[PDB]
């Protein structure tokens with residue numbers, strides 16, 4: 001299963017909302033998760049099964065989608081949100097990461 | 108309380124092999140999958156494979172079949188990944204991780220450098 005993420009990078013100001021998308025090469029039955037990878041930290045699971053927020057994760061993170069098309073959003077951007085985000089499909093007992101999206105903050 | 112303790116850095120010559128390990132602590136090692144992921148310099152995360160210690164089942168990224176071999180030792184709660192016939196492109200940071208609806212824990216990551 002192939003995953004294509006978009007955009008590859010973006011720059012946004014604090015307080016705003018950003019949205020990233022991911023497209024699979026086949027129906028992955030909403031079995032998609034989103035990870036945040038901050039430099040110096042290990043990857044962190046934020047959302048799974050398309051829209052389910054991982055316990056302990058801020059509600060500023062959300063997801064939506066179905067079939068082959070999915071979206072992930074970060075509302076009220078904070079400085080600590082600067083990182084690379086990845087979608088991850090986990091259907092058919094396999095894992096496939098999207099190419100990643102580097103999010104940079106502006107001030 | 109939960110942690111995945113990853114093994115140290117490695118240096119190997121072309122054609123050689125190395126075996127990385129990850130010891131789990133804080134959760135039932137035999138009822139969850141453990142993943143192995145690669146990240147080459149300046150590149151994104153890549154899935155290598157997964158193993159379910161409870162029964163030994165393994166799943167591999169087609170790209171890594173023939174390169175990576177996953178095993179597990181339930182008595183020591185340790186999962187291992189062997190990289191065979193090492194080459195330049197294998198130089199990267201490798202992570203072990205238990206990541207699912209019930210918990211998200213990653214090893215600190217370890218480097219494998221392949222050079223003559």
Ligand SMILES: COCO[C@H]1C[C@H]2O[C@H]3CC=CCO[C@@H]3[C@@H](O)[C@@H]2O[C@@H]1CC(=O)O
Nearest residue numbers: 033048090093094095140157166206207208
């Ligand atoms: C590839 O490993 C084996 O398949 C399992 C992968 C697991 O990925 C998790 C990723 C992220 C969030 C939440 O849980 C996912 C989990 O459901 C998934 O389970 C796979 C095995 C199975 O479907 O039972």
